């Protein structure tokens, strides 16, 4: 079966005052591998993709700052505090050189990071990622009321503050398989409590679409351009039907990227992760395999 435990020893780093959690396997020397989830998930997301490439890489797997393990500290919880947190983060682990592996908004903040530390990039895996939505109508049709719903300040905090409708709805709704309880378990724990919701409802408010928030678009066309003209390794997964990247979208991007290798999972919305562990963990350990590092 797709595994449902979470058998890593517990490491905590202290950063900008407050602990962050993270897993930390595999060989202690050589060029380790970085898991940044999103939203409304932890490392945990990463749980069946780890034990293929720990047999030959580090593989260090933060949760975000008020999320997991990590502490809640009072913050607005904007993209600009997890960029923040997830720069002192590596900067607190000493890492020099590594490998991304990201997805949702950990892809923001690893290709933010990424253009911004370019040397220190060896290679980039990623799967269903921030890129820009132009317009509405190029958010999944199945979800378009759902997000422009988030993107309130009454209703969406009722639906995702109050009724926690992102981790009881949205993230189920982000898989092809069912999940069962042991697994919605762990990725309600960290949000047990209602007023620790925050970082739920302001990442989709944070979501570049139809041009808003201005400041987020532009961040991410950035890295959109850099990653156009960067040699970096690349590896993209995608599923069908996806939901922030189509396959349509997949084929373009295996097209225009440099370097890019590009793998069909099969079925998959958003936490492809969820849907064929497997596959993206052998890909990742194989891919590994052939970059110079
Ligand atoms: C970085 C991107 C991460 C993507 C994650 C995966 O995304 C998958 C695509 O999104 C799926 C979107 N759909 C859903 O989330 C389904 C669940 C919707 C909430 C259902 N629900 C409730 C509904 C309350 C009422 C609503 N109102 C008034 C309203 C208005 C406009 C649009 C939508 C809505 C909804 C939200 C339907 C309650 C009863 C609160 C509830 C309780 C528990 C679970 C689900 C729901
Ligand atoms: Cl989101
Ligand atoms: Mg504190």
Redesign the pocket.
Same mark, same amino acid.
């Given at each position: 079966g797709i595994g449902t435990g979470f058998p890593f020893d517990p490491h905590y780093v202290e950063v900008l005052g407050e602990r962050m959690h993270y897993v930390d396997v595999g060989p202690r020397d050589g060029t380790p591998v970085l898991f940044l989830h #999103?939203?409304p998930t932890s490392s945990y997301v990463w749980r069946n993709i780890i034990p293929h490439v720990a047999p030959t890489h580090r593989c260090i797997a933060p949760d975000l700052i008020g999320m997991g393990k990590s502490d809640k500290p009072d913050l607005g919880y904007f993209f600009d505090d997890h960029v923040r947190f997830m720069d002192a983060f590596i900067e607190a682990l000493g890492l020099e050189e590594v490998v991304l592996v990201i997805h949702?908004?950990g892809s923001a903040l690893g290709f933010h990071w990424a253009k911004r530390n370019p040397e220190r990039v060896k290679g980039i895996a990623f799967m269903e990622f921030?890129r820009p939505i132009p317009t509405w109508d190029e958010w999944?049709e199945? $979800?378009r009321? /759902?997000? =422009? $719903?988030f993107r309130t300040t009454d &209703?969406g905090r009722k639906?995702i503050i109050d =009724?926690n &409708?992102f981790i009881? #709805? /949205?993230?189920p709704? #982000?898989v092809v398989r069912p999940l069962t309880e042991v697994e919605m378990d762990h990725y309600r724990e960290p949000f047990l409590n209602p007023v620790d919701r925050e970082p739920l409802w302001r990442f989709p408010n944070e979501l570049p679409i139809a041009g808003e928030p201005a400041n987020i678009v532009a961040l991410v066309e950035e890295y959109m351009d850099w990653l156009h003209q960067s040699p970096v390794p690349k590896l993209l997964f995608w599923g069908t039907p996806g &939901?922030?990247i189509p396959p349509a979208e997949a084929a373009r991007l295996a097209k225009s990227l440099p370097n890019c290798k590009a793998v069909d999972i099969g079925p998959g919305?958003?936490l492809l992760q969820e849907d064929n562990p497997d596959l993206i963990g052998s890909e990742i350990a194989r891919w590994l395999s052939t970059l110079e590092i």
């Open positions: #999103g939203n949702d908004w921030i999944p199945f $979800a009321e /759902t997000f =422009q $719903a &209703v639906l =009724q &409708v009881e #709805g /949205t993230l709704m #982000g &939901v922030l919305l958003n």
